[PDB]
Ligand binder design. Structure first.
Ligand code: NAP
Length: 333
């Protein structure tokens, strides 16, 4: 018989790509959603091998118990749902607690009611490994060993810092659970940088603007006199992140590992240069800046050697990820 994979936050951008990939390899999927209609929409998109359960609040003890009890066929759990909204009334209630408590409660639910689950993957982030000023530093070398120094108290102050904290603390909690609770499953994490690339379904393009994907896609909203975007950092293609999740549960080597998913540096000029060459009909409708003035040669390469060895595949290049993302938006209008 077939294996079932559980995916929390099935509505999301990364989660959908993960689902499409997992389905392609012959797994069944069970997705968590915050509403019935949200589930129903996904079901129409993904078909018969996809099912959903409604889990409205992560941060309640036993939130996943019923859903797990309903799906004894599931032997893999991918916990991807997390807050990603930076502008909030209460950083704790809206960012920190759902990530941290929600993560702690999922793991406990799996141990309580899903002993059959062999593998759990937590979707972390580079923000778990760092602080904001570090990410942009040519002198900083991140690795799978890196942990953020941000305090919980500091993390509270505003939404961005809260997200950084939410990831670091939830991930630490996940590792702590494994140590303390001695579950049946092995844990692994995936720690991505900014995620670019096309959405899993064309139908989902119009609906919400994922904060990372929109960093690429927003270029289409520029006009000829606008400034070059100041957006900058490191990227990873969504399809690569999804493949990493697959590796994260499939490979023996992945057990107990953190995977740093990071490719190349970019800025707004890099982005503009790609789009203008690829979509030359847009050239007259976009700024030019200073083509190929971007220089990243000073930046020390991050140490992802272990992750790359474990994964064993090559990443999508920046132009490809960008072009694929734009082609989709154009197709849909
Ligand atoms: N994509 C990136 O650039 C990036 C970078 C670093 C790390 N990550 C990690 O990858 C995951 C996906 O990120 P994303 O960019 O795809 O964000 P996203 O598109 O907004 O996905 C977040 C999903 O999780 C659910 N969710 C959000 N906040 C929640 C809360 N407080 N309680 C319960 N459910 C909640 C939402 O479900 P509904 O649709 O039902 O609201 C949403 O579909 C994140 O958890 C993040 O930790 C992503």
């Amino acid at each position: 018989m077939t294996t079932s994979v559980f995916v929390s936050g099935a509505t999301g951008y990364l989660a959908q790509q993960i689902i499409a990939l997992v389905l392609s390899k012959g797994y069944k999927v069970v997705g968590s959603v915050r509403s019935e209609e949200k589930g129903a929409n996904l079901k129409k998109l993904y078909g018969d091998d996809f099912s959903y359960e409604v889990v409205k609040v992560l941060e309640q003890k036993g939130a996943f118990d019923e859903a797990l009890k309903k799906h004894p066929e599931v032997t893999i759990f991918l916990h991807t749902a997390s807050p990603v909204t930076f502008e909030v009334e209460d950083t704790e209630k809206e960012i920190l607690i759902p990530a941290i408590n929600g993560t702690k409660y999922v793991l406990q639910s799996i141990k309580d009611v899903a002993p059959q689950i062999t593998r759990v993957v937590y979707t972390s982030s580079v923000v778990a490994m760092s602080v904001p000023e570090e990410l942009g530093s040519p002198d900083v070398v991140l690795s799978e060993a890196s942990w953020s120094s941000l305090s919980y108290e500091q993390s509270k102050t505003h939404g961005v810092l809260a997200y950084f904290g939410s990831k670091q603390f939830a991930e630490r909690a996940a590792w702590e659970f494994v140590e303390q609770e001695k579950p049946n499953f092995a844990l692994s994490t995936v720690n991505p940088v900014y995620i670019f690339g096309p959405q899993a379904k064309d139908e989902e393009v119009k609906g919400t603007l994922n904060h990372s994907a929109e960093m690429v896609n927003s270029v289409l909203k520029l006009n000829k006199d606008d400034d070059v975007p100041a957006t900058t950092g490191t990227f990873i293609d969504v399809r690569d992140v999804a493949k990493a999740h697959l590796a994260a549960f499939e490979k023996d080597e992945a057990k107990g590992e953190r995977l740093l998913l990071s490719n190349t540096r970019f800025n707004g000029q890099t982005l503009l240069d790609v789009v203008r060459k690829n979509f030359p009909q847009l050239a007259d409708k976009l700024p030019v800046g200073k083509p190929h003035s971007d220089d990243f040669s000073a930046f020390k390469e991050w140490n992802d050697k272990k992750t790359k060895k474990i994964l064993g595949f090559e990443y999508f290049d920046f132009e490809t990820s960008v072009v694929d993302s734009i082609k989709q938006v154009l197709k849909v209008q």
